[PDB]
């Protein structure tokens, strides 16, 4: 509560902004000219305020657009059907209930398509609007004024919500994707160091977050294309997709770290005295990889180009040293007596797996640098000092 | 559309059930005994059906409970504050709009906790009810008479929805958990066979679904605790948690299959002619593993206990034969000339990784059998024919 608000003060301004918009609309309702008609449906502007206030600008715009589409299409259909029903003078309510059944069937079937799972909020407003408009206009006609009057209040509430959200300490979604990339870049290096240290002893959140955030970064990329230029991101079509390409290149590397972590939890393990022979070569690779990943993260954070010096020299040298060391002592991994128990042989063979997975990670490192170079070319990154 | 319906005929009955409930409510609203007030709020009963109709019984029962909690607490608070406001006679609107501000702030702050992410639908009902009751009773008193009528309409709509859902071809969430476990059991075996065949060539959906459905198996289990006894599951407290334990035991095995699939996409790979030496031993393990997993899935499906014979004899024998074969021809994995380039050495060493991962999978198989035995003990499974 108090602790969570203290740690993140972004969540205490949003609640106050929502309260401020609600207070504004409440005052505008309470202090108004005594017009008898609207006081029976003036409660709609505050429900619109409650329903259309979202955390980010891009989400607000995109979901308001979808809700408006649904409302307007449902209203058009309801008006058309109500106009048509008059022909069947003897059976008007029968026709209305038969239209309600069919529309409810169709609207419920079309929302169960798996590819429309993220738009379930826009299929509810369609059915609500159709049913409300059809049932509320049956008596005494009055179909076309039970729509304009209740749509103008919705417009007013949406305008108030948009103004308050957009003109007072706004939160953007592109700066959230920009920060998420940097966080993943640091988590992966922490995980790698932890795994190597744990194996060499006499880790999970990092690669888990680096391998389980594809949908978060895609929702964030779908919210960031609605927002206008601001701050450092001065351009009409900012390439938000190259960030996702870099994230995928990094996740491909994180898979190997996940396999290395799985190596520790294995039922079959190698003796300690055999592990201790390769300590320094195994540790140097992890040190160099962590340094490279942190350097790439810092360069991404400040929007800077790569320098002239090669970044993969040291880790490649360490990997070649590791290969030479493995070649020199390969007689500890296999047994030559049987050349032409089983648990001991499996334990002896289980160390080559760890070494080969480390070498595979080092080999995979280069796609990330290629993707970073492409992204820094697409967006105008500053020349390094 | 039509293809989706023909593939899955369960989605054509849900859509007709919703339509039928809507039609019933519409008929009751269109053929009602003339009433002065009730006729102006009849529409409140046809939107409840839209809002509370869910795919499964338990979800409908868990979410209606929470929605009722939110609505009742909001109504109580609104009535209390309306009674309280009378003391400040000079400034009534100011007090009302200040309590609106405070309630909006607190309700927005309490829903941003990370542990209340799945209950966002109940924090909206609270604010909507509070604001509606406060704003609708300001003129002409009438605070305790605008609640009972609309809550009777809400109750009627919810009752119609519940009756239609529970008395016409219901869908249960425990038969969905029970089906999901069997599906994972078959997907994993298909993935394993595909991976082995692909590596020996001269796989993704299986382990992907077996490793990414933990939340589905927890949501279905939280829905299935509300449902009364029915069909084969005759008991007051059915052990739905042993299914989750078995699923986790299977996921621990699926991790190594994912690693084996990853070994195929590596940058460093071994020559084909050297792989071909171990073909039969590599294929026998996959065949036996697939057969065992399919046997376990079939026995889970029919709710039957394991027989007296040991199910892990053949796979253990195949693993031992593979280990002997590797021990006999170990000189193709290392190079002894250097005993005291790197690309070819890494390629040669990359095959021991595959063999060791296969042996680790065989080693991990036994916890799944332990979990199955425990589950078949906890629930009364039929003795084998
Ligand atoms: C012949 C014709 C030819 C064509 C010509 C053109 C003619 C077309 C004319 C078009 C005019 C049509 C306008 C018709 C007005 C009728 C609207 C009725 C309606 O919209 O229906 C009810 C109504 O309710 C009420 O009281 C009012 C509540 C307000 C609704 C606002 C919804 C959003 C509107 C669209 C988007 C706006 C923004 C657009 C951008 C604009 C920028 C300026 C909906 O309710 P709701 O959305 O608030 O839903 C609740 C639910 O009620 C809870 O219970 C919760 O439940 P839970 O999920 O459990 O938390 C949640 O679900 C929660 O969403
Ligand atoms: C806009 C006015 C109509 C609103 C209709 C949707 C209201 C959603 C609230 C659901 C409350 C469900 C309470 C269950 C009642 C019960 O049977 O005990
Ligand atoms: C937008 C409309 C939301 C639905 C709110 C309709 C009112 C239903 C809830 C009123 C229940 C009030 C009961 C309070 C009795 C008490 O606990 O003292």
UniProtKB/Swiss-Prot annotation, chains A, B:
Membrane-spanning ranges: 12-32, 41-61, 68-88, 94-114, 118-138, 151-171
Keyword presence, Transmembrane helix: yes
Keywords attached to this entry: Chloride, Ion channel, Ion transport, Membrane, Transmembrane, Transmembrane helix, Transport, Vacuole
Cell compartment(s), UniProt: Vacuole membrane
GO function terms (MF aspect): monoatomic anion channel activity
GO biological process, one term: malate transport
Cellular component per GO, a single term: plant-type vacuole membrane
Activity-regulation annotation: Slow activation by external aluminum.
Membrane keyword on record: yes
Domain of life: Eukaryota
Membrane topology: Multi-pass membrane protein
Result of knocking out the encoding gene: No visible phenotype.
Function: Vacuolar malate channel. Has a higher selectivity for malate than for fumarate. Also exhibits a weak chloride conductance.
Recorded family membership: Belongs to the aromatic acid exporter (TC 2.A.85) family.
Protein name as catalogued: Aluminum-activated malate transporter 9
């Amino acid at each position: 509560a108090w602790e969570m608000g203290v740690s993140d003060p972004r969540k205490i301004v949003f609640s106050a902004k929502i309260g401020l918009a609600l207070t504004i609309v409440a005052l505008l309702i309470f202090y108004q000219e005594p017009n008898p008609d609207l006081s029976r449906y003036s409660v709609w502007a505050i429900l619109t305020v409650v329903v259309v206030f979202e955390f980010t600008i891009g989400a607000t715009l995109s979901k308001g657009f979808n809700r408006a589409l649904g409302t307007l299409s449902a209203g058009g259909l309801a008006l058309g059907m109500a106009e048509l029903s008059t022909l069947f003078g003897d059976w008007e309510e029968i026709f209305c209930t038969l239209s309600i059944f069919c529309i409810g069937f169709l609207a419920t079937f079309m929302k169960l398509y798996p590819s429309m799972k993220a738009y379930e909020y826009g299929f509810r407003v369609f059915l609500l609007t159709y049913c409300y408009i059809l049932i509320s206009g049956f008596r005494t006609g009055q179909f076309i004024e039970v729509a304009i009057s209740r749509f103008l209040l919705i417009a007013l509430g949406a305008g108030v919500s948009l103004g308050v959200n957009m003109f007072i300490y706004p939160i953007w979604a592109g700066e959230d994707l920009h920060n998420l990339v940097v966080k993943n870049f640091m988590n992966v290096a922490t995980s790698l160091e932890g795994c190597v240290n744990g194996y060499l002893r006499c880790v999970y959140k990092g690669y888990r977050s680096a391998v389980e955030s594809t949908s978060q970064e895609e929702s964030l990329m779908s919210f960031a294309i609605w927002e206008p230029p601001h701050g450092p991101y001065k351009s009409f079509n900012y390439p938000w997709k190259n960030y996702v390409k870099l994230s995928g290149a990094l996740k491909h590397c994180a898979f190997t770290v996940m396999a290395l972590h799985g190596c520790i939890l294995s039922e079959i393990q190698a003796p300690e005295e055999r592990r201790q022979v390769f300590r320094q070569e195994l540790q140097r690779v992890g040190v160099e990889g962590a340094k490279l990943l942190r350097e790439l993260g810092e360069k991404v954070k400040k929007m800077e180009k790569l320098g002239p010096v090669d970044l993969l020299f040291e880790v490649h040298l360490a990997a070649e040293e590791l290969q030479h060391k493995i070649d020199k002592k390969s007689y500890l991994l296999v047994n030559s007596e049987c050349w032409e128990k089983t648990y001991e042989s499996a334990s002896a063979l289980s160390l080559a797996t760890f070494a080969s997975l480390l070498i595979e990670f080092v080999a995979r490192l280069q796609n990330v640098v290629d993707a970073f170079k492409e992204l820094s070319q697409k967006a105008n990154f500053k020349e390094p000092e």
